[PDB]
Amino acid sequence: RCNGVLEGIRICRKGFPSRVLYADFKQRYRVLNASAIPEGQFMDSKKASE
Amino acid sequence: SKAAADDFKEAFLLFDRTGDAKITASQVGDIARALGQNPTNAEINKILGNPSKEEMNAAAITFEEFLPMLQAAANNKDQGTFEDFVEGLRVFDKEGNGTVMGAELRHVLATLGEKMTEEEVEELMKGQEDSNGCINYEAFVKHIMSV
User: Fold this and answer.
1) Closest approach of A13 to chain B, Cα-based (Å)
2) N or C: which end of chain A has fewer CB within 10 A?
């Protein structure tokens, strides 16, 4: 509480809880529009998920 | 329901080697697959045990138990989605083209999860993998879903 950790969580939650790392995002979900999501993830580790 | 498909009873006469109209419990997994049902082997195992049925001791069957077990497996055919089969193998190899290196698919199909023999793995790759060592799984999963 006194750290700021709990306050950073607060401010976050005013917020977007779950946050996926891009590769961790590719792999697990490529399969959803398989062709177009795989291309995105492979073509730009980030731009992909996009 | 009949739609009463009486050809399931005619196929039971093609799998019973004694002609007495009974099929052992060890054949029921492969005959559900030959009637157009793909229950996983753990599912076929569970159901059996679930019903205090031991596949470890001698077994016989009657058509009156095999018919309702095929009808209990027939609801699970909604799990056979080809989007997830092609996307599984698309996450298994890099680049934008559907090719698994030969030995990657052979060792994964024999040792990961439900063990497929390497004889059956070679019979499922025979023709779809050429001498480049690259299995095109777009046509490979197409031909696996043709049977």
Assistant:
1) 32
2) N
